[PDB]
């Protein structure tokens, strides 16, 4: 009965690995958008741009 019960534990572990894989797949694009946001802000910090570039 114990050895049969272990299969559900393996299924739960595999389900948790799948959930973490989905979270990492989202984190890739989240980090990329954060990098592009830092680029846009660091470029906007310059005072030599005209108002249209800042907008």
């Amino acid at each position: 009965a114990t050895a049969s019960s272990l299969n559900s534990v393996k299924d739960s572990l595999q389900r948790g690995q799948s959930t973490i894989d989905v979270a990492l797949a989202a984190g890739d694009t989240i980090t990329d958008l954060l990098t592009k946001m830092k680029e846009k802000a660091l470029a906007a910090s310059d005072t030599s741009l005209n108002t249209a570039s800042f907008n």
Partner: protein
């Protein structure tokens, strides 16, 4: 005649000083005291003091 040419040159000088600008900003017309261009990724500036020529 020398006075008239002197006044015409002063007007052309003021015009050329007015036209010294690049995409709406300048270091020559006196519209601003300085421009702070980027120096590093953290946002530190490389200041360039304006030199008015008006």
């Amino acid at each position: 005649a020398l006075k008239a040419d002197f006044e015409s040159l002063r007007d052309q000088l003021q015009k050329a000083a007015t036209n010294a600008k690049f995409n709406g900003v300048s270091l020559a017309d006196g519209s601003t005291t300085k421009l702070s261009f980027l120096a590093n990724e953290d946002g530190s500036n490389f200041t360039v003091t304006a030199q008015t020529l008006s």
